[PDB]
Design a protein around this nucleic acid. Sequence first.
RNA 1: UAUACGUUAAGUGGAAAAGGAUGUGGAGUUGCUUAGACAACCAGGAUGUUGGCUUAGAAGCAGCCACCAUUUAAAGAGUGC
Length: 50
Amino acid sequence: NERKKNANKIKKLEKTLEYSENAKEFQLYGELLTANLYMLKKGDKQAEVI
RNA sequence: UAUACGUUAAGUGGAAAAGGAUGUGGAGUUGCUUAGACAACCAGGAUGUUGGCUUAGAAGCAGCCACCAUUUAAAGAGUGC
């Protein structure tokens, strides 16, 4: 049990894990806005980026 | 509407506590202190260093160790914004 049990629960961990990262996307762009922190409005959605 | 010496001002006097309080007057103790104190005002309040760690960035000021040394009148690897 404990062998197969936790083998199952831990491949299950991995299975559930692979999906979401959602961090460096928008991290690098927060850095971009910090860089271009002089062309901004508080009232926009879009950006222009390099 | 006595005499003399001080008190309080709250009408306490003339209703009461915990607790509060730069209230008050009295004594007394004790460091600063007319080479001038304290305050105010004026001048400065710097350097390696943004101390290093970590942090995307932590740059006195997210958090961890450090908290040194120098110009020095003295300025903290920073007291708070």
